[PDB]
Amino acid sequence: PDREKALELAVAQIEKSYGKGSVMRLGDEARQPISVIPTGSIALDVALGIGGLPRGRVIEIYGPESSGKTTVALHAVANAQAAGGVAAFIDAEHALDPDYAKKLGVDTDSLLVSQPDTGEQALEIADMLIRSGALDIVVIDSVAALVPRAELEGEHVGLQARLMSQALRKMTGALNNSGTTAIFINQLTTGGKALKFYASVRMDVRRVETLKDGTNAVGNRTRVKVVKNKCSPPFKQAEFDILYGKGISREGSLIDMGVDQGLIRKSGAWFTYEGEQLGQGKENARNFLVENADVADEIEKKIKEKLGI
């Protein structure tokens, strides 16, 4: 009717005065950027709409201890590097395991790392790295750990939030201008009040159940909810397996997402793909796909095309 135009108008004005993702129907298809940073899971890539993390924006990944949030962050680093990018890791937790990082695909040798003296030094160094123009990604581990100088020097209570707010204001312009993505890891959030609004993507990461091989724990089924998303309709969620000592089972996400799209049929325990059989049970289907990068890439190729991601 006459209203369909008045709404298009309203939406278009909102978009003009506030930016592309300022309002969306949840049912809308995403606006696909040139490049993004894939997450490691095609499921998580689809849930984000744009097929990975956006460039030049603030990302927040939060969840409990050992929930997988860091694992997600490292894959983002790995993929950024695989595409010839440079990565930085601002570390106030001192928890990183580079062997684990390596097995995911991170080029740890090339990884820039900084273990800052204070909260403000952490963000300042990060800001210097960003304004270089030379970075594709920088990870901050973590928000809770960004303790202010005054507190560290023993000098009121509330300025960590003020620190993040100050930092993000300056940093947000540098990231947009540089095309560098900043991932902020966060626990269940000192100055996460500011981060909540500056972030273009916020991901809630959690463990759903432990994966077992008979009696020993091969890994964890992980669940991520994209609670905030300026680059595509929000509130999507995905699941994927993080295997101990290996990381996110890419092959596992291809299968799962394959059967969801009807690219991979499932006559009982037997997963099939285009008349040929992938395996009986998920682990065989998974293992088959790492042994056969050809078909795994073809399945990945097909899923993207069907969804335009």
3-class SS at 298?
helix
User: What technique determined this structure?
Assistant: X-ray
Architecture of the domain made up of 24-248: 3-Layer(aba) Sandwich (3.40)
Residue 70 labelled as part of a binding site = yes
Residue 68 labelled as part of a binding site = yes
Distance CA 247, CA 253 (A): 12
CATH topology of domain 249-309: Rec A Protein; domain 2 (3.30.250)
Q: Name the token pair of 73.
A: 């962050």
Residue 249 φ/ψ, nearest 5 degrees: -75, 85
- Is 197 exposed, middle or buried (CB count within 10 Å of its CB: 0-12, 13-18, 19+)? exposed
**CB neighbours of residue 283 within 10 Å:** 14
**CB neighbours of residue 209 within 10 Å:** 9
Residue 66 labelled as part of a binding site = yes
Contact 220, 43 (CB under 8 A): no
DSSP codes joined into one string, 161-194: HHHHHHHHHHHHHHHHHHT-EEEEEE----SHHH
- Name the strands in the sheet holding 112-114, side by side, starting at the edge strand that comes first in the sequence: 112-114, 87-91, 137-141, 181-186, 58-62, 201-213, 216-229, 236-243, 247-248
Contact 218, 185 (CB under 8 A): no
The resolution in Å comes to: 2.8
Distance CA 261, CA 264 (A): 7
Residue 210 labelled as part of a binding site = no
Residue 69 labelled as part of a binding site = yes
